[PDB]
From Swiss-Prot, chain A:
Keyword Acyltransferase: no
Binding site for ATP: 181-188
Extent of Basic and acidic residues compositional bias: 41-58
Disulfide bonds: none
Designated name of the protein: 26S proteasome regulatory subunit 4
Cellular component per GO, a single term: nucleoplasm
InterPro entries recorded: 26S_Proteasome_ATPase, AAA+_ATPase, AAA_lid_3, ATPase_AAA_core, ATPase_AAA_CS, NA-bd_OB-fold, P-loop_NTPase, Prot_ATP_ID_OB_2nd
CDD domains on file: RecA-like_PAN_like (cd19502)
Disease / disorder: Birk-Aharoni syndrome: An autosomal recessive disorder characterized by failure to thrive, severe developmental delay, intellectual disability, spastic tetraplegia with central hypotonia, chorea, hearing loss, micropenis and undescended testes, as well as mild elevation of liver enzymes.
Position(s), cross-link Glycyl lysine isopeptide (Lys-Gly) (interchain with G-Cter in ubiquitin): 192
Family: Belongs to the AAA ATPase family.
Biological process according to GO: proteasome-mediated ubiquitin-dependent protein catabolic process
From Swiss-Prot, chain B:
Coiled-coil stretches: none
Natural source organism: Homo sapiens
Superkingdom of origin organism: Eukaryota
Functional description taken from the UniProt entry: Component of the 26S proteasome, a multiprotein complex involved in the ATP-dependent degradation of ubiquitinated proteins. This complex plays a key role in the maintenance of protein homeostasis by removing misfolded or damaged proteins, which could impair cellular functions, and by removing proteins whose functions are no longer required. Therefore, the proteasome participates in numerous cellular processes, including cell cycle progression, apoptosis, or DNA damage repair.
Compartment(s): Cytoplasm; Nucleus
Stated family: Belongs to the AAA ATPase family.
UniProt protein name: 26S proteasome regulatory subunit 8
Subunit: Component of the 19S proteasome regulatory particle complex. The 26S proteasome consists of a 20S core particle (CP) and two 19S regulatory subunits (RP). The regulatory particle is made of a lid composed of 9 subunits, a base containing 6 ATPases including PSMC5 and few additional components. Component of a complex with USP49 and RUVBL1. Interacts with PRPF19. Interacts with TRIM5. Interacts with NDC80. Interacts with PAAF1. Interacts, in vitro, with the thyroid hormone receptor (in a thyroid hormone T3-dependent manner) and with retinoid X receptor (RXR). Interacts with ERCC6.
Residues of the full protein shown: 267 to 356 of 406
Swiss-Prot record, chain C:
Family the UniProt entry places it in: Belongs to the peptidase T1A family.
Keyword Phosphoprotein annotated: yes
Function: Component of the 20S core proteasome complex involved in the proteolytic degradation of most intracellular proteins. This complex plays numerous essential roles within the cell by associating with different regulatory particles. Associated with two 19S regulatory particles, forms the 26S proteasome and thus participates in the ATP-dependent degradation of ubiquitinated proteins.
GO biological process: proteasome-mediated ubiquitin-dependent protein catabolic process
Residues bearing attached sugar chains per UniProt: 185
Keyword presence, Ribosomal protein: no
Name by which UniProt lists this protein: Proteasome subunit alpha type-5
Induction, as annotated: Up-regulated in colon cancer cell lines. Up-regulated in fetal Down syndrome (DS) brain (at protein level). May be the target of the transcriptional activator NFE2L2.
Location within or outside the cell: Cytoplasm; Nucleus
Swiss-Prot record, chain D:
InterPro entries: 26S_Psome_Rpn1, ARM-like, ARM-type_fold, Proteasome/cyclosome_rpt, RPN1_C, RPN1_N
GO cellular component, one term: extracellular exosome
Segments for region (Required for interaction with UBLCP1): 708-889
Modified residues (N6-acetyllysine): 551
Entry keyword set: Acetylation, Phosphoprotein, Proteasome, Repeat
UniProt name for this protein: 26S proteasome non-ATPase regulatory subunit 2
SUPFAM superfamilies: ARM repeat
Organism taxonomic ancestry: Eukaryota, Metazoa, Chordata, Craniata, Vertebrata
Amino acid sequence: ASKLPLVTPHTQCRLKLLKLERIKDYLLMEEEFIRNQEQMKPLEEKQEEERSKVDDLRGTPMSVGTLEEIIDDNHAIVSTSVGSEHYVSILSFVDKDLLEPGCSVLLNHKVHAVIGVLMDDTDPLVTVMKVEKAPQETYADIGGLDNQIQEIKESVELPLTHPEYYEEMGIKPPKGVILYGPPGTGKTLLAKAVANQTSATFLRVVGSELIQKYLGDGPKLVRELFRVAEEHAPSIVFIDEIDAIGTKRYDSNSGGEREIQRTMLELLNQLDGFDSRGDVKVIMATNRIETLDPALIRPGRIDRKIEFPLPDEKTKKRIFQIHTSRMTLADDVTLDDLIMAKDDLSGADIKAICTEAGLMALRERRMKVTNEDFKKSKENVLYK
Amino acid sequence: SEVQRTMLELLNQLDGFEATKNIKVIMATNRIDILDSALLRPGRIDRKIEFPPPNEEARLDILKIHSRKMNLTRGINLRKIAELMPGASG
Amino acid sequence: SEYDRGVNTFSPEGRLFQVEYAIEAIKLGSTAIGIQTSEGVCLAVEKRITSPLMEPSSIEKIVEIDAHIGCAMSGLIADAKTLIDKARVETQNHWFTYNETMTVESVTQAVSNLALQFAMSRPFGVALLFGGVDEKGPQLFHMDPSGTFVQCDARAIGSASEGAQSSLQEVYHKSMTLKEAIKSSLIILKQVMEEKLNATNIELATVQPGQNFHMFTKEELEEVIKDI
Amino acid sequence: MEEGGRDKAPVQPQQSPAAAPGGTDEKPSGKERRDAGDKDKEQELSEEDKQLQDELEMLVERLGEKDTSLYRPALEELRRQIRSSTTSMTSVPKPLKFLRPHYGKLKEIYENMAPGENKRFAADIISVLAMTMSGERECLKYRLVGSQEELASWGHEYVRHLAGEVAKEWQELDDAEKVQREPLLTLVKEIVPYNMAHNAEHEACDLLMEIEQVDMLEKDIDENAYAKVCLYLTSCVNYVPEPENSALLRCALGVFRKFSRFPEALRLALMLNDMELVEDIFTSCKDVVVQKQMAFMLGRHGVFLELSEDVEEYEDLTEIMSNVQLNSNFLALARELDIMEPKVPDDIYKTHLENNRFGGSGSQVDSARMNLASSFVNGFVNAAFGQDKLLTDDGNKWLYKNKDHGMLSAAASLGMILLWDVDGGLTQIDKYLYSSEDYIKSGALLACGIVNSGVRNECDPALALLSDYVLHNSNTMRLGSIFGLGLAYAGSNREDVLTLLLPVMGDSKSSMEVAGVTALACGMIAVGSCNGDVTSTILQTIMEKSETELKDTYARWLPLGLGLNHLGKGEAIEAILAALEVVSEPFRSFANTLVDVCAYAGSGNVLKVQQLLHICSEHFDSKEKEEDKDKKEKKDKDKKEAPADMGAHQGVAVLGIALIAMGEEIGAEMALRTFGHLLRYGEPTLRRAVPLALALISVSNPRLNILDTLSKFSHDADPEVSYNSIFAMGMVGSGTNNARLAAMLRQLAQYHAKDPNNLFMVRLAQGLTHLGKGTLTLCPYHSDRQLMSQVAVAGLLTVLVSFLDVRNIILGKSHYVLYGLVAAMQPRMLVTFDEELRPLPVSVRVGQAVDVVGQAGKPKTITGFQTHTTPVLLAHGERAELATEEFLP
Amino acid sequence: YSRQIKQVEDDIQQLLKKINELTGIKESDTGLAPPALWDLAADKQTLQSEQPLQVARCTKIINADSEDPKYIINVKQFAKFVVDLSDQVAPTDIEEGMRVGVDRNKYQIHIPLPPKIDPTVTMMQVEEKPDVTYSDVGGCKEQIEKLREVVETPLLHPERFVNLGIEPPKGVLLFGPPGTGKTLCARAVANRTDACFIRVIGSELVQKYVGEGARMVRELFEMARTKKACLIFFDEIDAIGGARFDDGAGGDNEVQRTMLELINQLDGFDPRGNIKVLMATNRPDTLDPALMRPGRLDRKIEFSLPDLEGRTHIFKIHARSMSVERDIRFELLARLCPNSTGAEIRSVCTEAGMFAIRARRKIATEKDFLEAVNKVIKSYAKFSATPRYMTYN
Ligand SMILES: Nc1ncnc2c1ncn2[C@@H]1O[C@H](COP(=O)(O)OP(=O)(O)OP(=O)(O)O)[C@@H](O)[C@H]1O
Ligand SMILES: Nc1ncnc2c1ncn2[C@@H]1O[C@H](COP(=O)(O)OP(=O)(O)OP(=O)(O)O)[C@@H](O)[C@H]1O
């Protein structure tokens, strides 16, 4: 791997022909010398029989140890599974580069010497925290807003798709972004839309499960959450309903709001860690933003704040056209009457109305909706 | 109230973010006025269903399906027994 | 906590911090400059217009205390309104009782007396610059929301006050004429205003030993703008 | 799908041409007018590059093949009237009508005859009708015709005019992007006779556009990075008049003159120096041209300006060339002394304070060889114009204590002190010329040589003091009596004092160490095409070294005197003239590996690369030619210093997978010496790769080689985090890598970085990448640095003071007529963009901006902002005159 | 030529992809490196790991004994018994609280005894310095110099202090406005240092159990005192201890023990000596007076909000990179944002650059900076994090 980066000419030219001929001749002498090394110096065969001798020197089982300290000169102390640690030697082929404390190592069964390092067999919570596939429709699905969409593309999507503009700007793209507003306006979905659009690794967990039953486990949890976030890729991390951590109290926690405060100070450290952060981007969403500690919201930790207003009626009819598109509607229905049917209605409300109208039509095995279906839908959905 | 918070993380997990279909959630409780406003957005919950206390026909039917499995006697008139109890519960 | 700012709490060390917060709040206002010369006293403020809709005539900071004393305004204007009204009525009843015109120091001391009095529950977000003439000649007094009034020959208040004060230290001396002082004040104002100087972008007033409180030299200041 | 009904072009241009016997005969109106309609409809619709499936370029040809098979390949009665209106439809969509081997029959449709001209109906095309046609023609048909016989009947003159018009077509269609395809097509046709197309396109590009003389210029230099053997020779020499004829830039005449001088001829840039004397345009750019002429890459030019003392400003031009016109020394007293650099920092030695309390007791270091390192403690820090007034007292009493070689070492390290201060440095060295010790007096003579290195002073104080010691009775004043003089008079290649040191080879005295370093000093003045130096060395080699060939002191220094200075010239006959008379015995053919690549400093000769590898890779020679295989790999480190940053990638790839991967004594002893020369800035690839073999010393080898691998690992740029590893190497170096043989070596590595934390250029990438000197002092340093007792007794003659050809580090400067401007500059990363778009930025890291001198470093291309109207060179080189004006900035 | 461009390069680069793979026949590690370098010592120097050196597992010293050695050894929990180990080292390296490599039947001494500590604190050293300097921190110059003569001349030449016979100060607190302040200048300090720079974030010290934080504080002080001089950084000490305020049922004792034991460790009974520590928090009024005692908190660096000159200087600092029409009015920009913090100012310049790159522009203007500042300081003015924290309450 890592041969040479060159995509400059990309044409019928000696600036490509020369490069290709020189590199293929370099591969030619590489091939000729490696042919030299197993022809007049085969030893036995020197490619896999050496591997065979190592594998023979490798013990059949794995006395798996846990690493706790390092000594440079081909030995160290390792702790056994039963807990009786040993100061065993290492192998010459123990590939002394990916050794880290707390890691699984293949040891011998007799002398227990460090034979090799063990690849981790995945991790439980990396599977839980990582969203696998794209959820749903892209930015054509929202409708109505058309302003915060451009902003969040500028702050998140634009650094990835156009990593050139900031270079002639000589400037850094914004880091921390709050989404806020009345609930049901489309924050955690706008989250779904941007999750669909992006190609980077995506992380999602809600603040509600940041409470935990002991002391310090919350801050520790945030620690390896961000560790997983850093160790994979350029990543976008999404936390939803952060205000719950400050609003809803519980009894399952060992400590009260004190341990909550400790978790808060840890995450305030984590957003502005003086250690090298890198290309990890942060997206938040919270309806009750006023209850949060304002020092979390600061520039350097949070750069953008985006309000989500209640939808306008011209946006309401856009939502009507969007959501009722794939369903069969009769001519007797009218969206315009249903626009102002409620003074204070949300984007969840219209979807709930149309789904209830769909199931009400399914009650009588009917394919098309009628006006009375919405007329009976409105009080079922909203009015209780 | 931890039942409600579990419904928070579960229901926001099953909203498009998941990929494995045929998974749904059922909640049984009482006194719906006490639960938080978070589950009260109409998009959160698809259906809410009330169970009334049993009336005379329901009491008689439940009495039948429980009296199926004892050594009864010919001639009972379980209607009188059902109307004797003023519908405690099932 | 909220009990810390109840009414009257000094500091962990030092004087009351809320009046110090009024001191830092006074920088959130348009600047003003005042020069006291033997030939006369000159005052100038910035209108700070935001749009061509409203008339600049209603954008009023400099007012007349009486026929020989004027003053500027800074910070919260509605806070200044009460103090200016009280100063006007106390000057008028002092003339009524004392059949004469007073010194600027009396008015300055009176507004300093009202400044501490807590309308209550906070100091007033306003710093005034009294200017005029009395029996001992030209007078210019500076006042702060803490109430410590003091005399000054040249002063700049409001936002950007210290840079203007530094330029005043650079250029002001004793034997400057009134025209020279006005020209220097306009020069400094030009280098401290963010927008280009216009006919109604600023406002000027002056007090002479001979003439009364001048009528803001309206439509004559374009002569002293265009020449420079 | 939608097809049929609207297929009018697959019907009426399908029925009419299929009846070509029915059209050309018995229907002349049809054959003329319908073909004219097909021409002027396709030429406007199917003849612009829009998509593959055009309406006639791909659509009508589906049946149109049988419309084309007999329309006009066979009529046998052709006239004038049916060559404009019958070579009318079938000429256009032919590369997609026919298959891939249409190149042989490429003539048969379009190249037969056009209606008057190709551009008559090629004007509505982008690439296909004429541009792809010309590309295929010049690629294959003109190639095969012009392979042996260019002008037979037709395939030259029409081809010449076609080349002439496409030379303007590459700009007229769009003068943005495919103008760079004009050198593409110019190189594709007549590759070996590139001059024949270049003279054709030269005046055409000269009349093309004044501001278009720059992208073709840089495309030319990118192709001029490497090419075939005669190809770069003709391309550069035809490239030289380009920045002069149309463009009046004329300041890249120096670097182009350099590129054209040594590969093509001997006195080619001497003619270009005469042309520099001709182009007496405004003197700021003239003075900046002659700024390069001594003290950046090459000198020896003090006789071409005193034409009857008539050149305008002669006395200032001479003060600039001579490097005696302190533009880096006044700089030295004004830039870093006044900001960050004191005369006596002396800290990296004193930094060894933290490690004493790790592992237990401290102060265990009690050897004497470590005092040698103490020399560099006052030596290496005293570069960039420091001073040690009695701060060399630690060296003074040690110069009166032990170690004759150490006395010589300290006295030679004194010349590092006052580097380039010829006027003040002699007064500080004088006090030692009067010593009762030959080692101290010899080290003071070497110090006088070191102070003059790269500075041509009118008083010749190096020659005038060292002359009297060259033939001296002993060796301290005899051997070391000449090394500084060659260092003083290297670039100023004066043959007069060279003749004075010629009879030292003819001394015929016992000079087993001395005659070898004499060949070093003579070659330091001049090597390669040197008439007396070659003859004297080869005759002395037969006279003594032929009967005894035992130790590397003999035949690793006399081969260095043959052709190291003229390694840029690649005619390879200097290899022939120096080896073919000494190919007698294998230890005398041992030097043939030197002489072969002593014409091969930098080029593309992968064929010459592979012949140095395949014929002698390992062969298991068993201690007879193994050292010669080491030298061949030691001659593989060059040719890769500036391979357009390309062969270095494969070079570090093959070195990792061959020598250290599965090798022998070749890969066990001097494998890392290639890295010692390859890079000089330091990148994390080798910065981790070397300590794999260095920190694990693997002392089975004579570990001084691995120590030498560790020592030359400090080749990188001066400021680094790399301190910590070589400090941690000090941790393992306390007990292991004992003080008896390594203590001077490890400490030398840390101070190699922290010399003047700046002031370093022998990388041979000057200006942007160009060559010059950088080897005549560097190559001796590692050649005698194997592992053995050479570097201890005999190495101390040189290893302290081997390479002093450093020529500054910083470039960002002002250099006004008052020489004190502070004009706003803007540091930026090295250039990454070669041919992308017209408003390409030169760099990317645009954040940090000073206006005063700083660190130029290796990977930077500082140009500056504000448009200060600096039209002087705009090509960097640290002495821009900044002829300030106001072009509306 | 243009659509024909893709016919020359492929014929050689696919061949390149063949021979590079054919050379790439030493891979598929899953616990290895390239075996030409991984198993580069796959010769007998593998067998000498077996027969010369034997297991020599860890141990724990318990008690000494008179005359002949006969020391008492713990394994970890296996057995607790008395042997004499061997004779290849002099019996003066044995002290209680140490770990020897000891066999199961021969009980060889092997190597001298290193201390055992948590791997977490070994990980906790950062060994990386961020690329921030003492030049790019402007607005707090007197705070800068006050921290210059805390972490320099003790680390540099001590002959001045010895000559004047003055012990240098140890306990230094640096503090400032919330959010803008101590953290980035602490990175600068870690940039300019030479010895180790032990990070401590206060939130991590709390554990599931009780009193473990005391154990890791003891361990970190021990590994610090292994060095001659080493720097200790403390962040957000407010959570790691406020005050002893216990009433009725125990409240927040679990952290109280940790803060009090570090207070015992800093002062009294042969202290760390040459160890420099420093702490920074978010609210100072809530700290304990015993932690506030001098000898642990000698210097009191307090950063405030810059008046105008610091604001102009930071405007210089962050904005030497963006394109402008030469002339600027940065001082009037600073006058426009009187009570504004440094990261807010960097956010203002960031959003000005974002407004410039909105449609097609390449250089922001003065009105672009106006459009930055009005939608930063007086459109996001609702929260701003300042007012309840300038009183630090
Ligand atoms: N503008 C809108 N148009 C249509 N549906 C909307 C709109 N805004 C929100 N919704 C609905 O809101 C529901 C939840 O979406 P999202 O995860 O983005 O959170 P939210 O709307 O902010 O509300 P909540 O906080 O209650 O989850 C979805 O069922 C979606 O249909
Ligand atoms: N003097 C200064 N010059 C330039 N930038 C400064 C200066 N002081 C602070 N900053 C800015 O402060 C921001 C971060 O502040 P920092 O984190 O160091 O402060 P703090 O008080 O430790 O708060 P917190 O760690 O809780 O965010 C950076 O964006 C940095 O640019």
